[PDB]
Paper text:
One family, the ferric uptake regulator ([name]) family of metalloregulators, is involved in the regulation of iron, manganese, zinc and nickel homeostasis through the activity of [name], Mur (manganese uptake regulator), Zur (zinc uptake regulator) and Nur (nickel uptake regulator) proteins, respectively. Previous structural studies of members of the [name] family of proteins revealed that these transcription factors fold into two distinct domains, including a DNA binding domain (DBD) and a dimerization domain (DD) localized on the N- and C-terminus of the protein, respectively.
The structure shows that the protein assembles into a biological dimer in which each monomer folds into two domains, the DBD and the DD, reminiscent of other ferric uptake regulators. The modeled zinc atom is tetra-coordinated by C105, C108, C145 and C148 in the S1 metal binding site. Despite adopting a V-shape structure, no metals could be modeled in the S2 sites. Intriguingly, akin to the S2 site, no metals could be detected in the S3 site. Instead, four water molecules establish several hydrogen bonds with residues forming the S3 sites. Altogether, these observations show that the DBD can undergo asymmetric reorganization when the S3 site is not metalated.
Author numbering:
A (entry chain A): 8 to 64, 66 to 91, 94 to 154
B (entry chain B): 4 to 89, 95 to 159
The structure:
């Protein structure tokens, strides 16, 4: 079972870097991995001090600050100021999708009874729910 | 339909097909890719001949050969990605659970929820679709990881 959200994020980060003439270095890999895996919301300073403590490889604060800006610009992370900006992964609300296997037709939908059961499932297992992915597959009326 | 949604279950199938080919020392070619794509995007239970003829009609530029059609089907059958009768083939579409993933430690919880299942059947009926499958992943942070740095 692969984590689709993480796989998507990692490919998008690499796509952006290839487009900017930049390499997927071990510094950049640990930065994205830290922001995805940690449940602490970092400032550029605390992200830089955290990676210093976990990986004295590198990595300087300039590299941290440029990588956060590339991520925010791409809307892969969101920042919030309050008095150093704190960052977290973007979890923009999105619709779910049903896809016709035969013609590729895509129908968007959102269902509040499903939404409510998804929060209940997280809660039954002690999880804090942060995102979801839900696709339905079938054959549309015109293809059938 | 103006929207780019990657079909996750199809990508999982293609990755498994790539794994099989690499195991059998075969290159992942456009000819082999179009065969898996035809099996998935159709309800027909093809035979090697009818699958050859369908690809010839739909993608004549690729010139997919009959030897490649049999060889690929035999490879997919040995891997249990397809089942056959007498031969006529059907892609395996085995029941599966839904999964919840901790973003920090990566632990996975498998689950099924009957309320969600019923809503999925109603959604499909409301749009005149015949439901054949689904995929649902929930993302979150487990009780061991909550407010913790990266494990
Ligand atoms: Zn259709
Ligand atoms: Zn965890």
């Amino acid at each position: 079972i692969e984590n689709v959200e993480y796989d998507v994020l990692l490919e998008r980060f690499k796509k952006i870097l290839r487009q900017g003439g930049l390499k997927y270095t071990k510094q950049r890999e640990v930065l994205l991995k830290t922001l995805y895996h940690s449940d602490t919301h970092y400032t550029p300073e605390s992200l830089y001090m955290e990676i210093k403590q976990a990986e004295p490889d590198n990595v300087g604060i300039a590299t941290v600050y440029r990588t956060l800006n590339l991520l925010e610009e791409a809307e892969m992370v969101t920042s919030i100021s309050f008095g150093g900006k704190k960052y977290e992964l973007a979890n923009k609300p999105h619709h779910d999708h049903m896809i016709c296997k035969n013609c590729g037709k895509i129908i968007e939908f959102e269902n509040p009874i499903i939404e409510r059961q998804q929060a209940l499932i997280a809660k039954e297992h002690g999880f804090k729910l942060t995102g979801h992915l839900m696709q339905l597959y079938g054959v549309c009326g015109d293809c059938n």
